[PDB]
């Protein structure tokens, strides 16, 4: 029966069927008294399988590589008469024909990516086997069984939870689609459980530590759960393309199904402010416990969690930050800024905004579905936007296909290309109704694309990977290729340059904006410059113009002219937004030639960090007293200040709350931690109050045995 | 503000914003006159005169007339004005959801604009044109006067809402079709025929697309609004179908139809019942929840309505022996036992007797050139890269050629038409040995309605070359390169079997032949396994087993006849009356395995439609429907469904029960509001028997 299908869909890793202990059709053939899977952290298996790190008790192993087991019999194994095989099965509806029920026959010698087990040793009543997974095996928690074969059918062991084995992806294996050439990278992109996230803006790149915590207790299990909550067919869990294509779509709770509820409202009603999270562990576990979407997240929190996901299952992955990101490009390689007849920027017609920065993920894998050469890193943005399917994540999009405008290849390529390679067009909206494009800034969007380096906390410029150099046959042709493969370029694109340098200030200080015109030709010009200063979210969405100023300049031929504006703290203070960012529009009009000059910059105000100092024994198992101090920089009282602490391997994420803090006051929070991991660890603190927020801190600790 | 976006998304055609009348001074419009009325140049020339709708309807990228009447004569000296078309609540000229039509001396190709075609005593007669890349939907119309002190504008007036649709008549629209017959067939035809049965006994059926009926155009848009589709995306056929097809199969309370194949159908209409798309879509708009229940051809008919109603030339394709749920594997596993027996314990994959999916015409500018045209869209979900969904627009040209690296979901459809059956012996000790590969079963015939009449049109050659030839081998080797999977490494005694087709309740034959071309003899040991199955291939139960024993002298040809008796099946037939016959055999000498399989469906008898009366529009006409219980049993709770677009709205009637061999008659009076060759369609669905259809080829006059 079924109608639709003989056997229901096998799409849960938790669901299980029981296998018959005996099933004959038509007793001393051998019987198992015990099975030993050399698990143990210190032991052979886990260490050689790089799984020795997980805070987990069952045996964890990576596909395509051989592992050890010993089977204890009720009598010596006689190769002349006995017969058996090890079994591994996943889900309620196993099926050999779909890698969900796996035989593993004992073999003379193990072959290239084929399941098999070579008998390696025989004692009195014990056989030591060397079992080999296939490099294409599904990933998930399998059930183990030993089946003795009688000529009348089989006798097999019974449900034993202690023998469940986990098979993860294998970056160290030459045949795994997710294979990585060398240890440095593998260590970093897979084994590292801490990363730095780059925010701020290009001329003042800021960083903060994020805990991936992929080896903490429960996380490996939550990742299987996420796939289960997505009803992911088990037969597809061995495909990294499909894992990232499905796992990413689960990150953003459309309605209420995914992991996180995205919110950029600066209020965050009944949830945690995206800026408070110190890492992935809290979220993922909190999701598991409620089976409901965690609130709230924004692009970096979605990218953090997804990076934990990928690495935890064994897929090499890293977060990437793009500076001046054209999110919601809809494949349009242009951003429209509208100007009034008198040079100003039309506050009403300009509803499109460039993000100060926008992070996304990159996952390493091959691309058997695309032509040769498009393997390597794949861009996967889990912050939705309208693509072909309409308003979902994008990717895996081949990073190499992006750099060459080869946007005819899946998945979601035009939307990442246009995120990183699109121009700003300045248009004048005439009082009668027409529009004319003044100039185009082809070097503002995608200025800098960066990621944390293999060494330590330093940044790595990865801009050349997404694009060539603006103004070279290369960048020009890639741009043309993308145009024929559906990248939209709607509008077809007086020697007086001018630029302005804002001087990065501290939260609460007055600072300056220094405009500089340089009349390059041989004429005396009369210009009318206009300065527009707006308070904004990091996404570029404005909240208010807090400073408007217009001024005339009489430039001398071949000379120059500098104009310094002074921004007093009081003009902005009362209405800043979370990441304390401001945007500046500087437009000038040369009434002689009618040529227009426009420039825009973003600046994020600086705030002093949280202090973390350790006081104790930096030895695993021994106590150390962690101290976190914060000093209210503002001249007003902070209330309901939630301090946070984390550091995978040192402590579990904790959070304390202070009813209030008077201005210029300081608070200390002593905490005794019991470091369970040895080596270079790191603490992480974060702060968020009803007023001030998006304030972090970190310390690097050295813990040994 | 908004944090994430400056302005909330514009994804509802229903939401509207009230435009200000004076945003800050002479010329005031008294009235606008579009030439709506279905007899006029407007709807006629635009081919939109069939919709039962009173508002203006124009196909994008083509000119139409309108006339504005002003309080005083327009003077090109001191007068400035323009027609504005707006859609949604958050319009942006930037996003194409705000179109300000300026007066132009002449009309450029591909741009919005209104040429003043004539002016008289205070009235201007315009000839407006639209971008051939225009958003499809229901636009609002205004008239804005630009004074030295701001704009003056007309107010909210519903009577002008203009629908603008896709236009395959315009050579600059992505949807352009270069043949008027195909345009007629593929777009203007609101009646279609769906093919089913089985490759040897093709049954045909009639389906009411009903795109022009009262309320369908508006429900199609409603579907999109339900899918929260960004207005800017509605001008893109690709994204329209990609998002549209995803709405048809309700994934838990979301979509239009709830799929079901459990012969029960506990709380809705048995899929075999529906006569057309009409009431489904209307039931959908009214309940605002998913309609129960549907199957492949049903999904295909509702989608085919959604495309045609909007202007994209669509059509339904039926594949015989279609490997659904293939997961990109190019192989179907049939497990043989050691002696030659079909092992039903393992053999759990089934090939569909037939499967119906849509085909939509459009250019594909997102891929190389050579791939535009007919795009296969299958809204009956299966596991593709995204995981259990419709398999988006996939270029048939690519399929035919193996280029499965070009979206969308190409490997999965290329595999529905190209897998091979692999007969594998699962040895008793655990071993597996593949015995044979049938490279001629799946996708044996792919058919679609002919352009002229209700005939069949073999379009098999479009999807693939011929099994055995070079271009075919290549495409295969090519698809293999982009991810299609071929997991298993692959006596002149010819054996084939013929099954005669009997009617529901009649005994029938099944001859099995064996030809030996060798100069020696052999000992065959055959088996016949007959099962009762759904059209999907899933067996309900084996109703007849029979093991033969043959001895073939050299150069022999022995034929042996089996006999299936009505009683052997009558107890367990499934809704479509499919029977699956397997025939394995092993030449004892050589130990070779010969294997063949077939299907047949029991000829269920037609329902009778006969009409009497004035065959003229508006003139009453009587339709006589009658079904004769062909069962020797009592048919409980019998529903009879009446349909016929342009003639009657869908109707249904329930008969307590029908005594064996008796004949019920249903009589109703229709008032055909449409002329030309028309059609009446009927179906019957009772607690036991169902998948009984009847139709009549009338011709209304006037
Ligand atoms: Yb939901
Ligand atoms: Yb729900
Ligand atoms: Yb550029
Ligand atoms: Yb560029
Ligand atoms: Yb739901
Ligand atoms: Yb829901
Ligand atoms: Yb083939
Ligand atoms: Yb016989």
Coordinates of C-alpha atoms in Angstrom, one line a residue, chain B residues 8-361:
Chain B
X8 CA 8.4 47.3 4.0
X9 CA 8.3 44.9 1.0
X10 CA 5.8 45.4 -1.7
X11 CA 4.5 41.8 -2.1
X12 CA 0.6 42.2 -2.1
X13 CA -1.2 43.4 -5.3
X14 CA -4.2 43.7 -3.0
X15 CA -2.7 46.2 -0.6
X16 CA -3.0 49.8 -1.9
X17 CA -1.9 53.2 -0.8
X18 CA -4.0 56.3 -1.0
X19 CA -2.3 58.8 -3.2
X20 CA -2.6 62.5 -2.3
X21 CA -4.5 64.8 -4.7
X22 CA -2.4 67.8 -4.2
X23 CA 1.2 67.4 -3.3
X24 CA 2.9 70.7 -3.1
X25 CA -2.4 75.2 -11.4
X26 CA -4.7 74.6 -14.4
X27 CA -6.3 71.6 -16.1
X28 CA -8.8 69.4 -14.4
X29 CA -10.0 66.0 -15.7
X30 CA -13.7 65.4 -15.8
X31 CA -13.4 61.8 -17.0
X32 CA -11.3 59.1 -18.5
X33 CA -12.6 56.7 -21.1
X34 CA -10.8 53.4 -21.7
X35 CA -12.3 51.3 -24.4
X36 CA -13.0 48.4 -22.1
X37 CA -16.1 46.7 -23.4
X38 CA -15.2 43.3 -24.9
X39 CA -16.3 44.3 -28.4
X40 CA -13.9 47.2 -28.6
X41 CA -10.5 47.6 -30.2
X42 CA -8.9 47.5 -26.9
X43 CA -9.8 44.0 -25.6
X44 CA -10.2 42.5 -29.0
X45 CA -6.8 43.6 -30.3
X46 CA -5.2 42.6 -27.0
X47 CA -6.8 39.1 -27.1
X48 CA -8.3 39.7 -23.6
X49 CA -11.9 39.7 -24.6
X50 CA -12.7 36.3 -23.2
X51 CA -12.3 37.0 -19.5
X52 CA -15.6 37.4 -17.6
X53 CA -14.3 40.7 -16.1
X54 CA -15.5 44.2 -16.7
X55 CA -12.3 46.2 -16.1
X56 CA -9.7 46.9 -18.8
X57 CA -7.3 44.1 -19.6
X58 CA -4.1 44.6 -21.7
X59 CA -1.2 42.6 -22.6
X60 CA 2.1 44.3 -21.9
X61 CA 4.4 45.8 -24.5
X62 CA 1.5 46.7 -26.8
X63 CA -0.4 49.9 -27.3
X64 CA -3.9 50.7 -26.1
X65 CA -6.3 53.7 -26.2
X66 CA -7.6 55.9 -23.5
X67 CA -9.3 59.3 -23.5
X68 CA -9.1 62.0 -20.9
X69 CA -11.6 64.8 -20.8
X70 CA -10.4 68.1 -19.2
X71 CA -12.3 71.1 -17.8
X72 CA -10.7 73.1 -20.6
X73 CA -8.8 72.2 -23.7
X74 CA -5.3 70.9 -23.2
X75 CA -2.8 73.4 -24.6
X76 CA 0.7 72.2 -25.2
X77 CA 1.8 75.8 -24.3
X78 CA 1.2 75.9 -20.6
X79 CA 0.0 72.4 -19.9
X80 CA 1.8 69.5 -18.5
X81 CA 0.4 66.1 -17.5
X82 CA 1.0 62.4 -17.3
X83 CA -0.8 59.2 -16.6
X84 CA 0.4 57.3 -13.6
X85 CA 0.0 53.5 -13.0
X86 CA 0.7 52.4 -9.5
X87 CA 0.7 48.9 -7.8
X88 CA 0.9 47.8 -4.1
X89 CA 1.1 49.9 -1.0
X90 CA 4.8 50.9 -1.2
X91 CA 5.3 52.0 -4.9
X92 CA 8.7 53.0 -6.2
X93 CA 9.3 54.1 -9.8
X94 CA 12.7 52.6 -9.0
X95 CA 11.2 49.2 -8.6
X96 CA 8.8 49.3 -11.5
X97 CA 5.8 49.5 -9.2
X98 CA 5.3 53.1 -10.0
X99 CA 4.9 54.0 -13.8
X100 CA 4.6 57.7 -14.7
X101 CA 3.6 57.7 -18.4
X102 CA 4.9 60.9 -20.1
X103 CA 3.6 62.3 -23.3
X104 CA 5.9 61.6 -26.2
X105 CA 5.8 62.7 -29.8
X106 CA 6.6 59.1 -30.9
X107 CA 6.7 55.7 -29.1
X108 CA 10.1 54.1 -28.6
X109 CA 10.3 50.3 -28.6
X110 CA 10.3 48.9 -25.0
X111 CA 9.5 52.0 -23.0
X112 CA 6.3 53.3 -21.4
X113 CA 4.9 56.3 -23.1
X114 CA 1.7 57.9 -24.5
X115 CA 1.5 59.5 -27.9
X116 CA -1.3 62.1 -28.3
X117 CA -3.2 60.6 -31.2
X118 CA -5.9 63.2 -31.4
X119 CA -7.3 66.2 -29.6
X120 CA -10.6 68.0 -29.8
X121 CA -13.1 70.2 -27.9
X122 CA -11.4 69.7 -24.4
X123 CA -10.5 66.0 -24.9
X124 CA -7.2 64.2 -25.6
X125 CA -7.1 60.8 -27.2
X126 CA -4.0 58.8 -26.1
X127 CA -2.3 55.8 -27.4
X128 CA -0.4 54.3 -24.5
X129 CA 2.3 51.7 -24.7
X130 CA 4.0 49.7 -22.0
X131 CA 7.4 48.1 -21.4
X132 CA 7.4 44.5 -22.6
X133 CA 9.2 43.7 -19.3
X134 CA 6.2 45.1 -17.3
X135 CA 5.1 43.6 -13.9
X136 CA 2.0 41.5 -14.5
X137 CA -0.9 42.4 -12.1
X138 CA -3.8 44.8 -11.4
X139 CA -2.5 48.4 -11.7
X140 CA -4.3 51.5 -10.4
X141 CA -4.7 54.5 -12.8
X142 CA -4.3 58.2 -12.0
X143 CA -3.8 61.4 -13.9
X144 CA -1.3 63.8 -12.6
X145 CA -1.2 67.5 -13.5
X146 CA 2.2 69.2 -12.9
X147 CA 1.7 72.8 -11.8
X148 CA 4.3 75.4 -10.7
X149 CA 3.1 74.6 -7.2
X150 CA 3.2 70.9 -7.3
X151 CA 1.2 68.0 -8.7
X152 CA -2.6 67.8 -8.9
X153 CA -3.9 64.3 -9.1
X154 CA -7.1 62.3 -9.8
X155 CA -8.5 60.4 -6.9
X156 CA -9.0 56.7 -6.1
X157 CA -11.4 55.3 -8.8
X158 CA -11.7 51.5 -9.0
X159 CA -13.4 51.5 -12.4
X160 CA -10.0 52.1 -14.1
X161 CA -7.9 49.4 -12.4
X162 CA -6.2 48.0 -15.4
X163 CA -4.9 44.4 -15.5
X164 CA -1.7 44.1 -17.5
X165 CA -0.6 40.5 -18.5
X166 CA 2.1 38.5 -20.2
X167 CA 2.0 38.8 -24.0
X168 CA 3.2 36.0 -26.3
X169 CA 2.0 38.1 -29.3
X170 CA 4.7 40.7 -28.8
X171 CA 8.1 39.8 -30.2
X172 CA 9.9 41.7 -27.4
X173 CA 8.3 39.9 -24.5
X174 CA 10.1 36.9 -23.0
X175 CA 6.9 34.9 -23.5
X176 CA 6.6 35.5 -27.3
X177 CA 5.4 32.6 -29.4
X178 CA 6.0 32.9 -33.2
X179 CA 2.8 31.0 -34.3
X180 CA -0.9 32.0 -34.0
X181 CA -2.2 28.5 -33.7
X182 CA 0.1 27.7 -30.8
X183 CA -0.9 31.0 -29.2
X184 CA -4.5 30.0 -29.6
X185 CA -3.9 26.4 -28.3
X186 CA -1.3 27.2 -25.7
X187 CA -3.0 30.4 -24.4
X188 CA -6.5 31.0 -25.6
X189 CA -7.7 27.4 -25.1
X190 CA -9.6 27.0 -21.8
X191 CA -10.3 23.3 -22.4
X192 CA -7.7 20.6 -22.3
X193 CA -7.3 16.8 -22.5
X194 CA -5.2 14.8 -20.0
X195 CA -3.7 11.5 -21.2
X196 CA -3.4 8.5 -18.8
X197 CA -3.8 4.7 -18.8
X198 CA -0.6 3.0 -19.8
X199 CA 1.7 3.0 -22.7
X200 CA -0.3 0.3 -24.6
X201 CA -3.7 1.5 -23.6
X202 CA -3.6 5.3 -23.5
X203 CA -6.8 6.6 -22.0
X204 CA -7.7 10.3 -22.5
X205 CA -9.7 12.6 -20.3
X206 CA -11.1 16.2 -20.5
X207 CA -10.1 19.0 -18.2
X208 CA -11.7 22.4 -17.8
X209 CA -8.8 24.9 -17.5
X210 CA -11.4 27.7 -17.3
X211 CA -9.0 30.7 -17.3
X212 CA -11.5 33.2 -18.6
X213 CA -14.3 32.3 -16.1
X214 CA -15.6 34.8 -13.5
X215 CA -13.0 35.2 -10.9
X216 CA -10.0 33.1 -12.1
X217 CA -7.6 36.0 -13.2
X218 CA -8.2 37.5 -9.7
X219 CA -7.6 34.2 -8.0
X220 CA -4.2 33.6 -9.8
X221 CA -3.0 37.0 -8.5
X222 CA -4.4 35.9 -5.1
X223 CA -2.2 32.9 -5.2
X224 CA 0.9 35.1 -5.7
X225 CA -0.2 37.5 -2.9
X226 CA -0.5 34.3 -0.8
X227 CA 3.0 33.4 -1.7
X228 CA 4.1 36.9 -0.6
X229 CA 5.6 37.4 -4.0
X230 CA 7.6 40.6 -4.6
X231 CA 5.7 42.6 -7.1
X232 CA 8.8 43.4 -9.1
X233 CA 9.2 39.7 -9.7
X234 CA 5.8 39.2 -11.3
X235 CA 7.0 40.4 -14.7
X236 CA 9.5 37.5 -14.8
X237 CA 8.0 34.3 -16.2
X238 CA 10.8 32.2 -14.7
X239 CA 10.2 33.5 -11.1
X240 CA 6.4 33.4 -11.7
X241 CA 6.5 29.7 -12.4
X242 CA 9.2 28.9 -9.9
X243 CA 7.2 30.5 -7.1
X244 CA 3.9 29.5 -8.6
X245 CA 4.5 25.8 -8.9
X246 CA 5.7 25.8 -5.3
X247 CA 2.3 26.9 -4.2
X248 CA 0.2 24.2 -5.9
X249 CA 1.2 21.3 -3.6
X250 CA 0.3 22.4 0.0
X251 CA 3.2 21.6 2.3
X252 CA 1.0 21.6 5.5
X253 CA -1.8 24.2 5.3
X254 CA 0.1 26.5 3.0
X255 CA -0.5 25.8 -0.7
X256 CA -3.5 25.2 -2.9
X257 CA -4.0 21.5 -3.1
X258 CA -3.3 18.7 -0.5
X259 CA -1.9 15.7 -2.2
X260 CA -3.2 12.2 -1.4
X261 CA -3.0 8.7 -2.8
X262 CA -4.6 6.7 0.0
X263 CA -7.6 5.2 -1.8
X264 CA -9.7 6.5 1.2
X265 CA -9.7 10.3 1.1
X266 CA -11.3 10.7 4.5
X267 CA -12.2 14.3 4.3
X268 CA -12.3 15.7 0.8
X269 CA -12.8 15.1 -2.8
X270 CA -11.2 12.1 -4.4
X271 CA -8.7 13.5 -6.9
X272 CA -10.3 11.4 -9.7
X273 CA -13.5 13.4 -9.2
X274 CA -12.5 17.0 -10.4
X275 CA -13.5 18.0 -13.9
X276 CA -11.4 21.1 -14.0
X277 CA -9.4 23.8 -12.2
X278 CA -12.3 26.2 -11.7
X279 CA -14.0 25.2 -8.4
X280 CA -10.6 24.2 -6.9
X281 CA -9.2 27.6 -7.3
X282 CA -12.4 29.2 -6.3
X283 CA -12.8 26.9 -3.2
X284 CA -9.2 27.9 -2.5
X285 CA -9.8 31.6 -2.6
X286 CA -12.9 31.3 -0.4
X287 CA -11.6 28.9 2.2
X288 CA -8.2 30.6 2.2
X289 CA -6.9 27.2 3.1
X290 CA -5.7 24.2 1.1
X291 CA -8.3 22.1 -1.0
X292 CA -8.4 18.3 -0.5
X293 CA -7.3 16.3 -2.4
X294 CA -5.1 16.2 -5.4
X295 CA -2.7 14.1 -7.5
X296 CA -0.3 14.6 -10.4
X297 CA -2.7 15.5 -13.2
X298 CA -4.7 17.6 -10.8
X299 CA -1.8 19.7 -9.8
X300 CA -0.9 19.9 -13.5
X301 CA -4.4 21.2 -14.5
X302 CA -4.5 23.9 -11.7
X303 CA -1.0 25.1 -12.6
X304 CA -1.9 25.1 -16.3
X305 CA -4.7 27.4 -15.4
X306 CA -2.4 29.7 -13.4
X307 CA 0.0 30.1 -16.4
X308 CA -2.6 30.5 -19.2
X309 CA -4.7 32.9 -17.2
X310 CA -1.7 35.2 -16.9
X311 CA -0.5 34.8 -20.5
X312 CA 2.4 32.3 -20.3
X313 CA 1.9 29.6 -23.0
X314 CA 1.6 26.4 -21.0
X315 CA 0.8 22.8 -21.6
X316 CA 0.5 19.4 -19.8
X317 CA 2.9 16.6 -20.6
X318 CA 2.3 12.9 -19.7
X319 CA 5.3 10.5 -19.3
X320 CA 4.7 6.7 -19.5
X321 CA 6.8 4.6 -17.2
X322 CA 8.2 7.6 -15.4
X323 CA 10.9 7.1 -12.7
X324 CA 9.6 9.5 -10.1
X325 CA 11.6 10.1 -6.8
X326 CA 14.8 9.1 -8.6
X327 CA 17.1 11.2 -6.5
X328 CA 19.1 11.7 -9.7
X329 CA 19.9 8.1 -9.8
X330 CA 19.7 6.8 -13.4
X331 CA 18.8 3.3 -12.2
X332 CA 15.7 1.5 -10.9
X333 CA 16.4 -1.6 -8.7
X334 CA 14.4 -4.8 -9.4
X335 CA 15.6 -7.5 -7.0
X336 CA 15.5 -11.1 -8.3
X337 CA 15.8 -14.1 -6.0
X338 CA 18.3 -16.9 -6.6
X339 CA 15.8 -19.0 -8.7
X340 CA 14.5 -16.1 -10.7
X341 CA 11.9 -14.7 -8.4
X342 CA 10.9 -11.1 -8.0
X343 CA 11.9 -10.5 -4.4
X344 CA 9.1 -8.2 -3.0
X345 CA 10.9 -7.8 0.3
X346 CA 13.6 -5.7 -1.2
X347 CA 12.1 -4.5 -4.5
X348 CA 10.5 -1.4 -2.9
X349 CA 11.0 1.2 -5.7
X350 CA 8.2 1.6 -8.2
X351 CA 7.9 3.1 -11.6
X352 CA 4.8 5.2 -12.3
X353 CA 2.5 3.9 -15.1
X354 CA 2.3 7.5 -16.1
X355 CA 3.1 10.9 -14.7
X356 CA 1.8 14.4 -15.7
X357 CA 3.9 17.6 -15.4
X358 CA 3.6 21.1 -17.0
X359 CA 5.6 22.7 -19.8
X360 CA 5.8 26.5 -20.0
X361 CA 7.1 28.6 -22.9

